[PDB]
Enzyme design. Structure first.
Site, PDB file in Angstrom:
ATOM      1  N   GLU A  28      27.281  91.828  21.475  1.00  0.00           N
ATOM      2  CA  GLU A  28      26.525  90.700  20.970  1.00  0.00           C
ATOM      3  C   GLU A  28      26.368  89.673  22.076  1.00  0.00           C
ATOM      4  OE1 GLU A  28      28.308  88.652  17.620  1.00  0.00           O
ATOM      5  OE2 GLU A  28      27.836  86.726  18.556  1.00  0.00           O
ATOM      6  N   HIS A  29      27.420  89.470  22.852  1.00  0.00           N
ATOM      7  CA  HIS A  29      27.348  88.523  23.952  1.00  0.00           C
ATOM      8  C   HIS A  29      26.344  88.914  25.031  1.00  0.00           C
ATOM      9  CE1 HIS A  29      30.620  85.799  22.795  1.00  0.00           C
ATOM     10  NE2 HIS A  29      30.230  85.066  23.821  1.00  0.00           N
TER      11      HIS A  29
END
Ligand SMILES: CCCCCCCCCCCCCCCCCC(=O)OC[C@H](COP(=O)([O-])OCC(O)COP(=O)([O-])OC[C@@H](COC(=O)CCCCCCCCCCCCCCCCC)OC(=O)CCCCCCCCCCCCCCCCC)OC(=O)CCCCCCCCCCCCCCCCC
Ligand SMILES: CCCCCCCCCCCCCCCCCC(=O)OC[C@H](COP(=O)([O-])OCC(O)COP(=O)([O-])OC[C@@H](COC(=O)CCCCCCCCCCCCCCCCC)OC(=O)CCCCCCCCCCCCCCCCC)OC(=O)CCCCCCCCCCCCCCCCC
Ligand SMILES: CCCCCCCCCCCCCCCCCC(=O)OC[C@H](COP(=O)([O-])OCC(O)COP(=O)([O-])OC[C@@H](COC(=O)CCCCCCCCCCCCCCCCC)OC(=O)CCCCCCCCCCCCCCCCC)OC(=O)CCCCCCCCCCCCCCCCC
Ligand SMILES: CCCCCCCCCCCCCCCCC[C@@H](O)O[C@H](CO[C@H](O)CCCCCCCCCCCCCCC)COP(=O)(O)OCC[N+](C)(C)C
Ligand SMILES: CCCCCCCC/C=C\CCCCCCCC(=O)OC[C@H](COP(=O)(O)OCCN)OC(=O)CCCCCCC/C=C\CCCCCCCC
Ligand code: HEM
Ligand code: HEM
Lengths: 419, 57, 446, 106, 54, 49, 54, 51, 54
Positions: free
Chosen positions: C60-61
C-alpha cells in the site's frame, strides 16, 4: 430531477428547497450573525451561544429537547464561522414536524436561565482546548488577530478571561440584535417545498427586519508570535486580497491551486506542487507547505502556510515565498494552469458532492444575494480566468503589505518585515 | 462562493451538544505524515478523533 | 407526500456482473457529475504468516510509487493533472484501492487501476526508501493512544490466531523483507474471483463493464500452483493485557466480548443494543443526566471523559464491546456502570428504549451512505463480506422485526456470563483485577 | 366560590401565621421550609442578593435561639410584609421533576 | 457509582474486607491471623451455650 | 512500538479442549464453565449440609 | 401532648385491676393511641400545609 | 408511589416475575428442608429420614 | 499539625468527640441521648459487680 426553489418572503426571510428521495430529510437555518459582530464589550458570546442550543426555552424544557431529538433518532447540530452562524438538523422524513418545532423554539425564543448558563461556562475551556489540539487552528485564529484591526480579528473561541464572565443578558442582547429575520435563510432538502411554506410562515410572526450590522474590519500588518518548545515550528504569512465575486478572487483560487493547496495522493510526496518541490530541494523532507485563502465579504486574505523543523523554518518560508515571486516574473505555463483549473473544478464538485456540505454551500450563498449559482456556472466563472489575471493576483501578493503569525521554537523564523 | 468548500481556508467549527466540530477546509493535514514527524498533541483532555459519523457493522 | 413506503424504494440498485476471469463488476448510476471507481481486494492482514506480516501494508505504501507502464512520478503527475484523488487503505481482512474523479475523466482512471493491480514496479531502491519511511511512520503512530489499545485488544482476544497480528507488522520483521517475498505475495494473493471492481455516481454500468474487460481481463483466474487459502473458525481467548506508563495524563481502556460473525442476523440486534449503550464526550453540551444511560453515567459525579461502543465483526468471529478514557481515580466506577448497562440489557429491556435504539440505528445506516465514496466502499466491502448488496429496504425490513425480547435473548446469548478480552493502556492501577471483571459480567439477583 | 368568604379565609390564615412563631424570630415563611433534594436544587438557583439575605435571616434565628430571646416587637415580620421568593424556583424544580418522572414511566 | 461507596456501613465493609489492597505474595502463615479472628467467635458462641447450664 | 508487542504462548496452561487455533470455543465454553460451576455447586451442598 | 397524655392514661390503666371502668378507658386509650399516629396527624399536617398556602 | 405505575413498569415486572418464582421456590424448599417439616417432606418420593 | 490529627486512634476521638460540628441552638433534650450512653456505662459496671455475687 428538480432545480432548487429559491424564494424570498415579505418578512425578509429567505427560503429554499431541493426535493430528493433519500429518506434522511435534512434542514438548515442560516443566520448572518457571526463572531465578527461581537465587539470588545461582549466578545466571545457566540462561542457560548452555539453551545446554548440544548438549553431550556419558553416553549420547551431542555429535557424535552434532548430526549425528544434523541428519541426520534434525529440530531441537531450548530456550525459556526466568522461570517455566518448555521443551525442544522437531520431527521427521518416523517418526524420533521417534531424536530423543526424545536428549531423554531431554539432560534426565535431562547430564554437563557442564568444558572444553566453558569453551568455551561466551565465547558468553554474544554471545547477551546480540544479545538486547540489541532495545530493549524492555533496559528490561524492568531493570524486573523494579526491581520485585522476590527471585526474579523475577533476569535471564534472564547478568550480565557471571559470564560466565567459571560452572562445571559449579553446573550439576549446578541440575540435580538442579530437574529433578525431579514438576516435569516432557511434551506430544506428532502422536505417538500409547500410544507416549508407552512413552517417558515410559522417563523414569519417573529422579529422585525434589519440587524445592528456594524463594523468593516480594516486591514493591518502586525505580527503575533508564541515561542514554544516544540520542534515543529509552524506559521503563515498573508497579504490582502479582493473578495468576493471578482474575477480576481477566482484568480486567487486558481493561484493557490497552481501552488498546490493540498495533496491528491495519499502517502505520496507532492510531485507537481511548486512549493513542495521548492522546499523539498531546499531542506530536509519533514515539512508541509501550502497556499491559504480566506474569503470574507468585507475582505479576503491570501498567503503561504507551513509546518517545519525549527532550524529549517527560515530556509522554508524564504523559499516558498520566492516561488510566488517567480509568478510575479510572469513565469507561468498555460498547462499547469489548466491542471489547476481542473483541480478547482474537480475539487469543488467533490466538496459539493456530499449533501451536507451542499447544504452548507446553498446556505452560504443564500445570504450574499440568494440567487443560487449552479456549479456549471461556477465552472464558467473559472474557465473565464486568464493567466494574466493570475499574474496580477500574485503581483498583488508580492507588492502588498504582509502580516504573519507563528508558533514553535521560533529560534530561526524570520520576522514579518524581513520575510 | 464564500463557503470553505468552494474556497479552501479557515475551519468552520461544527461544535455542538450532539456532535463534534470536525470539518473545515485546508489548512494542511495528513500530507505532513509522509514527511517525518507529525507527532500531534497528546491528551490535553483530548477527545477521540474521526467522530464516527461513518459507522459500520 | 414523501414517506418510507416510497422513499426507501427510490435509491437505485447496483447491477452486478461477472467477467470470464471471475472478477465481478458492480455499479450504481446516481445521476452525479462525479464517481469513484475502486478495487476492494479480499486480501487482509490475517492471511499473512509471521514470516511475511508486512507485505500487504508495504504494498500500500509503495503502490503509487511506480509501475511498469511508467515511473510513479508520471503516475502521480497524471492523477494530479486530472484533479483526481487516488486513495488506498488496508485492514486485517479487507485491502482496498480507489480513485476519485469526474465521470468525464472516468475511463482514464480505470485503466490505471488495472496497472496498479497487474504490474506495480518494485524498484529495490524504492523499497529501501519505503523501509525507513515505515520505520519513522511507526514511531509517528506511537503518539496515538486509541490504536495501540485496539491493537492490544486484538492481540489479547486472539493471541495465537492469525487474525491477532497487527496490519503494520513487527518493527523487527519489516527490515527483513525482500522483493521476492513481495512478488510471491502478489502472485499468491492478488487474483480474481477475489478481486472486486465497483463504482457509483455518474458511472453507467455497461460502460464500466466493457471498459473493465479491456484491462482487468489480464488478471489470472485459475489459481497458480492451485493454491487455496485455509480459513478456520478461530478461537476467542478470555485473556487480558495491561500496559502501564503512569506518567500519561489519562487511563485508556477497552473491553470486548466474542461476537457473531460477519455474516449473521444477530449482528443487527446487537447494533440496536449498541445504540442503547450510547456514545458520549465531555465536549458535548448534552451531558448531565441527559442522553444515553451510560452517557448519563459519564456525567453525574463526572465519570467518563469520552467513550464509544463498538462491534468489529470479522468473517469468522467479531468483537462486541466498549472503549473509554479514564481519570486515574475513576477507572473502577466507569466500569461498574458499563457492565451494569450490559446487565441491564441482559434483562430489563423496555420496548421504548429498543425503539429509540432502532431509530438511532436507522438514522445511522442511512446517514452513512450519503456521498459516492461511502456507497462505493459499501459495495466494495459488502460484496466481499456478503456477496449481493443488501438494499436498505432489506435492512429496515429486518430492523422492524427486532423486538425487546429479541434483544434480551441475543444480548443474554453473547454478552451475559462471558469471559471478555480486556485491554488497558495506562496509567491503569485502579482497574479491577480480571476476577472482579469476570464477576462483574453476571448478576446474582438474576 | 370564594369571594367575600375569601376575606374570611384570610382572617384564619393571619391568625395561623401569628400562631406559628417563626416570624417572631424574624424568619420569613420561605426560610422555614424543610430541605429535601428538590428544595436544595431550588436554593442553588436563587439570585446572589436574594440568597445572602436568606442566610443572614437564618443565622440570626439560630443565634436568637441559644439565647432563647424573641426578636423585638416592632421587628417581627408582618404578615403582608412577606416575600414568597422561593416559590417560582421550587415550582420550577418540582415541575422539572414531575416532567422527568412522567417521561420515565413511558 | 457502586453502592458500596455510598452507604457508610458498606463503606467500612468496603475498606476492611472487599477492597483493601494486600500484597499478592502473602503466604499461608498470615492466614493464621484471620483464623484467630474466627476462633474467638467460636469461643464465644460455643461458650455462650455452656453458660446456660453452668 | 505499537505493533511490536505480541502475547507469549500460554498453551502449556490451557485446557485440553481449546488448545487448537481452529475449532470455535462457543460450544466448548458451556462445558468449561459447566465443570467449574458444577464444582462450586457441589461445594455449596457440602457447606449447606 | 394529647398523645403523651394518652400514654399516661395507658400507664395508669395498666397499673390497675380489671374492671369495666378501667377496660373501657383502655379500649378508648388504645384506639386513640393508634388513630392519633395514623389518621389524625397527617391530615392536620395537610391542613397546616394549606393554612400557609403551600 | 403514584409514579411507579406505568406501562414500562408493567413490562419490567413481567420481565422479573420468573426470577421471583425461582427465588420463591428456593426459599420455600429451603425452609422445608431446614426445619424437616414432616407434613411437606413425606410427600416426596425418597426423603423419609423421619419415622 | 496537632498530635490528634496524625494518630489513627485519635482521629476517631477527634471526629466523634472533640471536633464534630453541632448546631449552636441545641437545647436540653439533646443531652438525653448522651445520657443514655452513660446510663449504659452505669448499667454495665454496677451490674457487673452483682454478677460477682448472684
Ligand atoms: C431471596 C431474594 C434474593 C434477591 C435479593 C434482591 C435484592 C435487590 C438487589 O438489588 O440485589 C442486590 C444484590 C444482588 O447482587 P448482584 O446481582 O451481584 O448486584 C450487586 C451489585 O452488582 C454490586 O456489584 P459489586 O461488583 O460491587 O459486587 C460486590 C460483591 C460483594 O462481595 C461480597 O460478597 C463480600 C464477601 C466477602 C467479604 C468477607 C471477608 C471475610 C474475611 O458482590 C455482591 O454484591 C454480592 C452481594 C451479597 C450480599 C448482598 C449485600 C446485602 C447485605 O443482592 C444479592 O446478592 C442477591 C443474591 C441472593 C443470594 C442467595 C440468597 C438465598 C437466601
Ligand atoms: C505445628 C505444626 C504446624 C504446621 C504448619 C501448618 C500450616 C502450614 C502452611 O503454611 O500452609 C501450608 C503451606 C503451603 O505452602 P506455602 O503457602 O508456600 O507456605 C510458605 C512456605 O513456607 C514458603 O517456604 P518454601 O517455599 O521454601 O517451602 C516450605 C516448605 C515446603 O512445603 C511446601 O511446598 C507446601 C506443602 C507441600 C508438601 C506437603 C507434604 C505432604 C503433606 O518446606 C518444608 O516442608 C519445611 C521443611 C521441614 C519439613 C519437611 C517435610 C514437611 C512436608 O505449607 C507449609 O507452610 C509447610 C508445612 C510444613 C509441615 C510441618 C513440618 C514439621 C516441621
Ligand atoms: C422525671 C421527669 C424527668 C425530669 C424532668 C423533665 C426533664 C427536664 C428537661 O430536660 O428540660 C429542661 C429544660 C431546660 O430549658 P431548655 O434547655 O431551654 O429546653 C427547651 C425549652 O423547652 C424551650 O421552650 P420554652 O422556651 O418555651 O420553655 C419551655 C418551658 C419554660 O421553662 C424554661 O424555659 C426553663 C425552666 C427552668 C427554670 C429553672 C427554675 C429553678 C430550678 O415551659 C414550661 O416549663 C411549662 C410551664 C410549667 C413549668 C413551670 C415550672 C418551670 C420552672 O426545661 C424545660 O423546658 C422544661 C422544664 C419543666 C419541668 C417540669 C415542671 C412541671 C410542669
Ligand atoms: C406468601 C409469600 C409471597 C411472596 C412470594 C415469594 C417472594 C420471594 C422473594 C421476592 C424477591 C423478588 C425478586 C426480584 C429481584 C429484582 C430486584 C430489582 O432488580 O428489581 C427492580 C424492580 O423490580 C420490581 O419493582 C419488582 C419485580 C418483582 C415483583 C413481583 C411481586 C409479585 C407479588 C404478587 C402477590 C402474590 C403474593 C401476595 C402475598 C401477600 C428492577 O431492577 P432494575 O435493574 O433497577 O431495573 C432496570 C433499571 N431501572 C429501574 C432504571 C429501569
Ligand atoms: C435451622 C436450619 C439451618 C439453616 C442453615 C442454612 C445454611 C445454608 C448454607 C448455604 C451456603 C452458601 C454460601 C453462599 C455465600 C454467598 O452468597 O457469596 C456470594 C459471593 C459473590 O462473589 P462474586 O462471585 O464476586 O459475585 C459477584 C457477581 N457480581 O461469593 C462468595 O462469597 C464466595 C467467597 C466466599 C465469601 C464468604 C464471606 C461471607 C461474609 C459475608 C459478609 C459480607 C456482607 C456485606 C454486607 C454488610 C452489611 C452490614
Ligand atoms: C478467646 C476466647 C476464649 C477462650 C480461649 C476460652 C477458653 C476456655 C477454656 C480453656 C476453658 C476450660 C474448659 C476445659 O478445659 O474443660 C473454657 C471454659 C468455659 N468457657 Fe471459655 N474461652 C473463651 C471465651 C469464652 C466466652 C466468650 C464464653 C461465653 C459464655 C465462655 C464460656 C465458658 C464457660 C461457661 C466455661 C466453663 C464451662 C465448662 O468448662 O464446661 N468462654 N473456656
Ligand atoms: C441496659 C442494660 C441493663 C439493664 C436495663 C438492666 C436491668 C436490670 C434489671 C431491671 C434488673 C432487676 C433488678 C431488680 O429488679 O432488683 C437487673 C438485674 C441484674 N443485672 Fe442487669 N441490666 C442491664 C445490664 C446488665 C449487665 C451489663 C450486667 C452484667 C455485666 C447485668 C447483670 C445483672 C445481674 C447480675 C442482676 C441480678 C441482681 C438483682 O436482680 O438485683 N445487667 N438488671
Amino acid at each position: 430531477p428538480q432545480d432548487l426553489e429559491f424564494t424570498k418572503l415579505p418578512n425578509g426571510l429567505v427560503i429554499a428547497s431541493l426535493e430528493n428521495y433519500s429518506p434522511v430529510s435534512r434542514i438548515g437555518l442560516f443566520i448572518k450573525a457571526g463572531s465578527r459582530y461581537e465587539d470588545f464589550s461582549n466578545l466571545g458570546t457566540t462561542h457560548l451561544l452555539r453551545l446554548t442550543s440544548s438549553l431550556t426555552t419558553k416553549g420547551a424544557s431542555s429535557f424535552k429537547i434532548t430526549r425528544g431529538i434523541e428519541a426520534v433518532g434525529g440530531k441537531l447540530s450548530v456550525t459556526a464561522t466568522r461570517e455566518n452562524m448555521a443551525y442544522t438538523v437531520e431527521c427521518l422524513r416523517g418526524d420533521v414536524d417534531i424536530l423543526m418545532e424545536f428549531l423554531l423554539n431554539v432560534t426565535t425564543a431562547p430564554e437563557f436561565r442564568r444558572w444553566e448558563v453558569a453551568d455551561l461556562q466551565p465547558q468553554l475551556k474544554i471545547d477551546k482546548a480540544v479545538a486547540f489540539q489541532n495545530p493549524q487552528t492555533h496559528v490561524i485564529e492568531n493570524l486573523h488577530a494579526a491581520a485585522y484591526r476590527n471585526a474579523l480579528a475577533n476569535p471564534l473561541y472564547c478568550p480565557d478571561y471571559r470564560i466565567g464572565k459571560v452572562t445571559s443578558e449579553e446573550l439576549h442582547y446578541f440575540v435580538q440584535n442579530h437574529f433578525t429575520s431579514a438576516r435569516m435563510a432557511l434551506i430544506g432538502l428532502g422536505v417538500s417545498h409547500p410544507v416549508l411554506k407552512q413552517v417558515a410562515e410559522q417563523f414569519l410572526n417573529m422579529r422585525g427586519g434589519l440587524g445592528l450590522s456594524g463594523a468593516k474590519a480594516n486591514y493591518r500588518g502586525g505580527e503575533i508570535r508564541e515561542q514554544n518548545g516544540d520542534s515543529l515550528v509552524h506559521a503563515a504569512f498573508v497579504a490582502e486580497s479582493a473578495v468576493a465575486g471578482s474575477a480576481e478572487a477566482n484568480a486567487f483560487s486558481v493561484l493557490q491551486h497552481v501552488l498546490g493547496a493540498g495533496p491528491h495522493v495519499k502517502r505520496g510526496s507532492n510531485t507537481t506542487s511548486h512549493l513542495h518541490q521548492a522546499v523539498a530541494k531546499a531542506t530536509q523532507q519533514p515539512f508541509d507547505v501550502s497556499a491559504f485563502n480566506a474569503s470574507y465579504s468585507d475582505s479576503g486574505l491570501f498567503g503561504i502556510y507551513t509546518i517545519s523543523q525549527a532550524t529549517a523554518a527560515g530556509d522554508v518560508i524564504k523559499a516558498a515565498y520566492n516561488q510566488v515571486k517567480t509568478i510575479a516574473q510572469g513565469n507561468l505555463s498555460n498547462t499547469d494552469v489548466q491542471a489547476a483549473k481542473n483541480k478547482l473544478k474537480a475539487g469543488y464538485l467533490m466538496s459539493v458532492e456530499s449533501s451536507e456540505c451542499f447544504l452548507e454551500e446553498v446556505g452560504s450563498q443564500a445570504l450574499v444575494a440568494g440567487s443560487y449559482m449552479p456549479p456549471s456556472t461556477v465552472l464558467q466563472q473559472i474557465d473565464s480566468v486568464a493567466n494574466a489575471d493570475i499574474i496580477n493576483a500574485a503581483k498583488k501578493f508580492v507588492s502588498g503589505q504582509k502580516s504573519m503569525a507563528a508558533s514553535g521554537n521560533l529560534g530561526h523564523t524570520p520576522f514579518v518585515d524581513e520575510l | 462562493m464564500l463557503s470553505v468548500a468552494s474556497r479552501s481556508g479557515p475551519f468552520a467549527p461544527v461544535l455542538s451538544a450532539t456532535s463534534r466540530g470536525v470539518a473545515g477546509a485546508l489548512r494542511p493535514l495528513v500530507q505532513a505524515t509522509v514527511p517525518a514527524t507529525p507527532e500531534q498533541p497528546v491528551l490535553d483532555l483530548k477527545r477521540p478523533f474521526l467522530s464516527r459519523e461513518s459507522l459500520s457493522g | 407526500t414523501a414517506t418510507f413506503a416510497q422513499a426507501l424504494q427510490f435509491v437505485p440498485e447496483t447491477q452486478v456482473s461477472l467477467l470470464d476471469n471471475g472478477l465481478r463488476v458492480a455499479s450504481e448510476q446516481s445521476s452525479q457529475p462525479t464517481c469513484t471507481v475502486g478495487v476492494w481486494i479480499d486480501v487482509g492482514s490475517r492471511f499473512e504468516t509471521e514470516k511475511n506480516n508486512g507485505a500487504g501494508y508495504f504494498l500500500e505504501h509503495l503502490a503509487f510509487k511506480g509501475t511498469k507502464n511508467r515511473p510513479g512520478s508520471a503516475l502521480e503527475k497524471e492523477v494530479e493533472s486530472m484533479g483526481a484523488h487516488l486513495n488506498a487503505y488496508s485492514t486485517r481482512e479487507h485491502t482496498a484501492y480507489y480513485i476519485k474523479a469526474l465521470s468525464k475523466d472516468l475511463p482514464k482512471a480505470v485503466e490505471l487501476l488495472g496497472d496498479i493491480v497487474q504490474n506495480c514496479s518494485l524498484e529495490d531502491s524504492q523499497i529501501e526508501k519505503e523501509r525507513d519511511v515505515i520505520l519513522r511512520e511507526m514511531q509517528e503512530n506511537d503518539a496515538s493512544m486509541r490504536d495501540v489499545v485496539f491493537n492490544y485488544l486484538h492481540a489479547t482476544a486472539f493471541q495465537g490466531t492469525p487474525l491477532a497480528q497487527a496490519v503494520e507488522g513487527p518493527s523487527e520483521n519489516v527490515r527483513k523483507l525482500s522483493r521476492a517475498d513481495l512478488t510471491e505475495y502478489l502472485s499468491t494473493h492478488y487474483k480474481a474471483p477475489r478481486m472486486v471492481l465497483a463504482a457509483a455516481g455518474g458511472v453507467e454500468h455497461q460502460q464500466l463493464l466493457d471498459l473493465a474487460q479491456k484491462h482487468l481481463g489480464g488478471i489470472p483466474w485459475t489459481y497458480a500452483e492451485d493454491a487455496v487459502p485455509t480459513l478456520t473458525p478461530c478461537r476467542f481467548t478470555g485473556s487480558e493485557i495491561r500496559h502501564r506508563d503512569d506518567a500519561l495524563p489519562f487511563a485508556h481502556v477497552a473491553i470486548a466480548v466474542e461476537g457473531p460473525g460477519w455474516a449473521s442476523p444477530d449482528n443487527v440486534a446487537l447494533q440496536v443494543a449498541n445504540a442503547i449503550i450510547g456514545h458520549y464526550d465531555c465536549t458535548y453540551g448534552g451531558g448531565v443526566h441527559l442522553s444515553s444511560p451510560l452517557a448519563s453515567g459519564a456525567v453525574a459525579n463526572k465519570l467518563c471523559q469520552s467513550f464509544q461502543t463498538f462491534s468489529i465483526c470479522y468473517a469468522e468471529t467479531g468483537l462486541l464491546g466498549a472503549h473509554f478514557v479514564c481519570d486515574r481515580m475513576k477507572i473502577d466506577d466507569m466500569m461498574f456502570v458499563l457492565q451494569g448497562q450490559w446487565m441491564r440489557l441482559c434483562t430489563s429491556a423496555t420496548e421504548s428504549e429498543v425503539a429509540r435504539g432502532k431509530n438511532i440505528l436507522r438514522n445511522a445506516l442511512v446517514s452513512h451512505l450519503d456521498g459516492t465514496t461511502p456507497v462505493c466502499e459499501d459495495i466494495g466491502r459488502s460484496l466481499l463480506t456478503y456477496g449481493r448488496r443488501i438494499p436498505l429496504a432489506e435492512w429496515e425490513s429486518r430492523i422492524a422485526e427486532v423486538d425487546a425480547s429479541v434483544v434480551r435473548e441475543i444480548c443474554s446469548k453473547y454478552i451475559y456470563d462471558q469471559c471478555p478480552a480486556v485491554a488497558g493502556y495506562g496509567p491503569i492501577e485502579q482497574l479491577p483485577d480480571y476476577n472482579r471483571i469476570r464477576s462483574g459480567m453476571f448478576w446474582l439477583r438474576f | 366560590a370564594v369571594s367575600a368568604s375569601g376575606k374570611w379565609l384570610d382572617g384564619i390564615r393571619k391568625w395561623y401565621y401569628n400562631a406559628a412563631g417563626f416570624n417572631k424570630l424574624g424568619l420569613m415563611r420561605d426560610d422555614t421550609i424543610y430541605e429535601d433534594e428538590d428544595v436544595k436544587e431550588a436554593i442553588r438557583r436563587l439570585p446572589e442578593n436574594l440568597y445572602n439575605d436568606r442566610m443572614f435571616r437564618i443565622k440570626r434565628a439560630l443565634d436568637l435561639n441559644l439565647k432563647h430571646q424573641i426578636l423585638p416587637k416592632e421587628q417581627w415580620t408582618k404578615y403582608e410584609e412577606e416575600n414568597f421568593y422561593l416559590e417560582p424556583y421550587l415550582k420550577e424544580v418540582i415541575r422539572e421533576r414531575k416532567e422527568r418522572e412522567e417521561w420515565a414511566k413511558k | 457509582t457502586p453502592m458500596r461507596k455510598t452507604n457508610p456501613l458498606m463503606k467500612l465493609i468496603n475498606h476492611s474486607f472487599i477492597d483493601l489492597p494486600t500484597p499478592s505474595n502473602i503466604s499461608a502463615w498470615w492466614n493464621f491471623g484471620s483464623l484467630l479472628g474466627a476462633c474467638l467467635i467460636l469461643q464465644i458462641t460455643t461458650g455462650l451455650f455452656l453458660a446456660m447450664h453452668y | 512500538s505499537h505493533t511490536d508487542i505480541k502475547v507469549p504462548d500460554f498453551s502449556e496452561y490451557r485446557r485440553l479442549e481449546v488448545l487448537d487455533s481452529t475449532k470455535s470455543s462457543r460450544e466448548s465454553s458451556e462445558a468449561r464453565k459447566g465443570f467449574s460451576y458444577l464444582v462450586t455447586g457441589v461445594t455449596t451442598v457440602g457447606v449447606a449440609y | 401532648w394529647l398523645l403523651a397524655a394518652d400514654l399516661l392514661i395507658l400507664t395508669w390503666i395498666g397499673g390497675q385491676p380489671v374492671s369495666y371502668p378501667f377496660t373501657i378507658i383502655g379500649q378508648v386509650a388504645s384506639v386513640l393511641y393508634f388513630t392519633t399516629i395514623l389518621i389524625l396527624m397527617p391530615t392536620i399536617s395537610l391542613i397546616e400545609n394549606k393554612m400557609l398556602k403551600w | 408511589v403514584t409514579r411507579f405505575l406505568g406501562p414500562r413498569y408493567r413490562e419490567l415486572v413481567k420481565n422479573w416475575v420468573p426470577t421471583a418464582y425461582t427465588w420463591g421456590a428456593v426459599g420455600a424448599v429451603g425452609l422445608v428442608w431446614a426445619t424437616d417439616w414432616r407434613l411437606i417432606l413425606d410427600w416426596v418420593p425418597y426423603i423419609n429420614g423421619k419415622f
